[PDB]
Design goal:
part of a larger assembly, 3 chains, A alpha+beta, B little secondary structure, C little secondary structure, A: alpha+beta, two-stranded antiparallel ribbon, 4 helices, 30% strand, C: little secondary structure, 0% helix, elongated, binds magnesium ion, RNA-binding, ribosome, embryo, Dap1, Habp4, ATPase H+ transporting V0 subunit e1
Chain lengths: 122, 17, 54
RNA sequence: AACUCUUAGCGGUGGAUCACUCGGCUCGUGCGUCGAUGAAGAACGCAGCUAGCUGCGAGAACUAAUGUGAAUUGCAGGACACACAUUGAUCAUCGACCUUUCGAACGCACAUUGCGGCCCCGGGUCCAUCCCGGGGCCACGCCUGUCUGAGGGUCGCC
RNA sequence: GCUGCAAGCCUCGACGAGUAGGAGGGCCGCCGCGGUGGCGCCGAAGCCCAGGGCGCGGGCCCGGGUGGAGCCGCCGCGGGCGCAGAUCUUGGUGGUAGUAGCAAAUAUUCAAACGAGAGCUUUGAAGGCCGAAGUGGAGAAGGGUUCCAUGUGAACAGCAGUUGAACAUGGGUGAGCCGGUCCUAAGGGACGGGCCUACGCCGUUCGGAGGGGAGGGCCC
RNA sequence: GACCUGGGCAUAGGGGCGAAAGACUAAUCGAACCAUCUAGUAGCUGGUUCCCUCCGAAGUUUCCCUCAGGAUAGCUGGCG
RNA sequence: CCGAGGUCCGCGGCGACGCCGGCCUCCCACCCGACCCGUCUUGAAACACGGACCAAGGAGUCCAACGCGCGCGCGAGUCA
RNA sequence: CACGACCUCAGCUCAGACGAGAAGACCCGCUGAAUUUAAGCAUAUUACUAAGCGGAGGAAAAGAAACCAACCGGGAUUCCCCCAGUAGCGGCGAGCGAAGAGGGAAAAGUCCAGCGCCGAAUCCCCGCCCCAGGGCGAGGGACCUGUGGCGUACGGAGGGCCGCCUCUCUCGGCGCGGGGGCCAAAGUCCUUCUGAUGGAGGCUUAGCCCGCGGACGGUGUGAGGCCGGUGUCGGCCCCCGCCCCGCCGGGGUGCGGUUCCUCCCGGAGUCGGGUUGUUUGGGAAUGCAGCCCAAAGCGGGUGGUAAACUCCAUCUAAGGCUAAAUACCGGCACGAGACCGAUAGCGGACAAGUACCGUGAGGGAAAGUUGAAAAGAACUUUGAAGAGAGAGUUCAACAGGGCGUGAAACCGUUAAGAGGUAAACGGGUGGGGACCGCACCGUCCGCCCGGUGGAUUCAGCCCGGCGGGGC
């Protein structure tokens, strides 16, 4: 139930401003839940994923307890790339497979001076 | 490209007797 | 929209050729030239009794 | 045998149907702001590799500033970016700055990058003429004031 | 015993053509909405069938194949609601049909090279035409890279191609004395004035206090 | 020779121009082309989409610048 | 039982996917019937017109006002 | 112009400003048709519309009565309902067509000229001084052919009389919403299935957890609890705005009552009349305009029939301003849909007013979809190469690049059958074929009955408890 009439609830508008969202908004859309060990230490629900974070795939074909490390954050396709979540091509070269940030869980944060500031407001 | 159809581009015939 | 179907200028070629005596688009070098424009039977034309908003 | 027709399987041709939808259409609400301080429109140009479209104007695919806080991406690659700790990638906002030529278009004209004038500056000339380069100007109509005038038009004093 | 959905069930008698047209019924069909009852990756919609069936009919149900994500029953409601025709609209495909045709301006021929491939490219020789009002050599208008070299042979060049005015990658137009620029011809068109309710129009050497260069040291 | 011809100019739609054919004015001329009023009007041709059940015609009267059409009466159906 | 419309307290051969069953659909054969639909028309199979074939789209609508019939609410009131 | 003043009229690239074009949905001023209707048509209608021209604003225009009414009177304008398809206009044919009253939305009123008192008490420019607001200069002008103050039809002014601190305006300093940022509830628990779960089942049946959050969207399928968000007039931060109050600081100047005295009191080629064209429901004129005539001041206008006399009612024309209710197919920014779903909906879901045609004005398309992820097919092999055969990727290549699903027409091929009186079709049956169905005693099913043979937390009857029926 949305009591506000200034925020749209439309299949057409919510999908346009999602695929055409700016990069600074695509950062917050590409969020990922924190581990139950970090969620009780930092007391933070979730955080936008970064480049040097160690995540763990929860859903999909590459799911398992293997904690890897993000290689790059493809902000355009709303997808990330992990170091051990890859696939061998036809010739043999390994190609990294894109995983949505909502299917991974952060196990180690890339703590900077700005990343820790966000943890304080939450 | 060309139109679908184009504009195409005389016996008097009066018998008497 | 009341302007739908009437966005074109089309005059029927009339009697004299094997066409079906229907308003056809003005000459040109497009596919649109020579096609039905106004009638409800014509593709891209006006609908029968456009739904008015009143 | 062939050939012709009929039925079914498979394969072609063709694109319907179904499902999908960052589009349209319609209604309602809040605002309701262009321009000689050069508008709308148009021309040309701008990316390491770029045709188009979009974005910009020789500071040209964006600069400064502020918010945001780690990317851009096709391949490159390289960041006075990243261990932000030589106060910042990107995005958003946008109070600074910039904005070529035509265009109401404004020196005169334009199927011409044609033809001029004035002032000032630097150089060649050093005998201030001339030549080149740079900058500020020169359209029409009208208002207020200044200045310079004109007519026995109406007078004053000689 | 059985029904009593009374908008139901049962009994009896007569009757049945039909265009134009009128009316009734529809548990006939399509899309959407408010209720309601469900179904679906253990396979929805759609599509196909020499499968099993229902209804007088409109149509519908089931099975098989294909497909891969939504769909339907009932009670009510709202329509852009049912096609064989309109020389209907748009798109697609046949017979005619390997058919008509590739027949204007005298002509090709031998060998070789390149090449997967040669009547058609290139070289040489032979034989011919245009025959200086040319099938020659250069321009104006127009075209706008078609110019030049190399590479390719998909498409195009109505046969072919080792070729091209095609495609791809690079390159190319240098002026004081060639022309534009300068002059006014026809003519266009400002200025003054007049006109038009107006945007504006008439008019062009005429018409306004229309003279902003030259000289004598302040004159003209 | 009342000749042929290029370029630059002039005349623009009820207007032009015409040694005069109603010729020519961009393949369009007894009135160009473009857009709009415009989905102009048509007593006139053409078409008008599912099923079953029941009933079922008229081309005749009168009036009309009517006689390819209407009005009116008749015949039809429906509700009662 | 010549009585309000039928019963047998009669019976035989076959019964494993085959020797049985489907008759609608598929193919084929024969007998009878059988001209091409739409449309205007007194009259269409017409030497009357439209239609080569297939798919999709394609035509009685909405607004104002009026009449009659019907459903509903209240009733000399009614509708805000 | 000998020397000046003035009037009238010029010049400049003179100092400082202003106008032009665009857009035009709505708005204002002109101009203006014909299709169409009248079953013809000429007035009428279409229509005081389309097109054409000029001018603006966020609204414009209108607007504080030369009004309506005829009543016990209403009181600017605009808008809605009603008046009303009415009065009326019209070859009185087709057709056209307002207004007063009344009920509502919104309401706000006022300034000059003239009249004439105040020593032009007024204004601009220039050079300055102080903190947007106030002064100075023996500077230059404008202006007596008239600036400013009081004052405008509700009467006004001056002088006696009577009663009465007079407070707005622009700046500094307090307690009184909006815009932009960032954060904030809860399952990826167990089992199972799938290419992937967002599916199914379970988590004392509180359905586990949250809930003022079960809107929507994303994510490999139907997600409140994975994620952005949603709910909380939640919390925080950076800008900015508004009214009132308070003191301080610069400029404002008092106002009323006066059946008391005196004075003053108004918009000319305008009204009106004739005439002409146009317009209107306005009809012997409703508005507007041209030409001619041309006013009055107990006057003038109106009182819906032309005209004379008379009475009565009503307003004060020929100067100006004014918000709000009202409109808005343009623009900027938003929310929504019993709408359309790629021959539909805008011409434009895509490098769409693009490609393209025309000398030009203009005309103007076609065109959406691989998969969850390119994992876009390594490598071997035949060919000059396109193009094939293996292998390989994927749940799937019945997804191989205009690649989801892949109909019909049409065509190739395979299987079956047939074919001299074009092919098809209706009715009847036969032959064949392709797929399907059908005992194993499916006429040994069921109620009752009679014997045979294995079993009866074994029945009527009785006790106790409970529950229910009974016009
Ligand atoms: Mg049109
Ligand atoms: Mg023909
Ligand atoms: Mg359309
Ligand atoms: Mg046969
Ligand atoms: Mg067939
Ligand atoms: Mg097929
Ligand atoms: Mg400029
Ligand atoms: Mg019958
Ligand atoms: Mg519909
Ligand atoms: Mg329809
Ligand atoms: Mg059809
Ligand atoms: Mg020849
Ligand atoms: Mg010759
Ligand atoms: Mg080139
Ligand atoms: Mg060449
Ligand atoms: Mg070459
Ligand atoms: Mg060829
Ligand atoms: Mg070449
Ligand atoms: Mg080329
Ligand atoms: Mg010539
Ligand atoms: Mg003329
Ligand atoms: Mg001649
Ligand atoms: Mg003649
Ligand atoms: Mg001639
Ligand atoms: Mg016919
Ligand atoms: Mg007839
Ligand atoms: Mg005959
Ligand atoms: Mg035919
Ligand atoms: Mg159809
Ligand atoms: Mg009637
Ligand atoms: Mg203007
Ligand atoms: Mg008529
Ligand atoms: Mg008629
Ligand atoms: Mg107009
Ligand atoms: Mg307003
Ligand atoms: Mg106003
Ligand atoms: Mg009033
Ligand atoms: Mg009435
Ligand atoms: Mg009228
Ligand atoms: Mg959801
Ligand atoms: Mg959350
Ligand atoms: Mg009139
Ligand atoms: Mg006004
Ligand atoms: Mg609007
Ligand atoms: Mg379209
Ligand atoms: Mg649009
Ligand atoms: Mg995709
Ligand atoms: Mg396919």
């Amino acid at each position: 139930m949305k009591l506000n009439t200034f925020v749209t609830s439309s299949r057409r508008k919510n999908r346009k401003r999602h695929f055409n969202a700016p990069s600074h908004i695509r950062r917050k859309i590409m969020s990922s839940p924190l581990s139950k060990e970090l969620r009780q230490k930092y007391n933070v629900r979730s955080m936008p994923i970064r480049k040097d974070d160690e995540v763990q795939v929860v859903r999909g074909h590459y799911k398992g307890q293997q904690i890897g490390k993000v290689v790059q954050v493809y902000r355009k396709k709303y997808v990330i790339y992990i170091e051990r979540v890859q696939r061998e091509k036809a010739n043999g070269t390994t190609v990294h497979v894109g995983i949505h940030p909502s299917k991974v869980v952060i196990t180690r944060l890339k703590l900077d001076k700005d990343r820790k500031k966000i943890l304080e407001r939450k | 490209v060309r139109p679908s159809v184009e504009k195409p581009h005389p016996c008097i015939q009066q018998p008497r007797k | 929209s009341e302007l739908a179907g009437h966005q074109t200028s089309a005059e029927s070629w009339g009697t004299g050729r094997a066409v079906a005596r229907i308003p056809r688009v003005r000459g040109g070098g497009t596919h649109r030239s020579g096609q039905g424009a106004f009638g409800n039977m014509c593709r891209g034309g006006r609908m029968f009794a456009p739904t008015k908003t009143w």
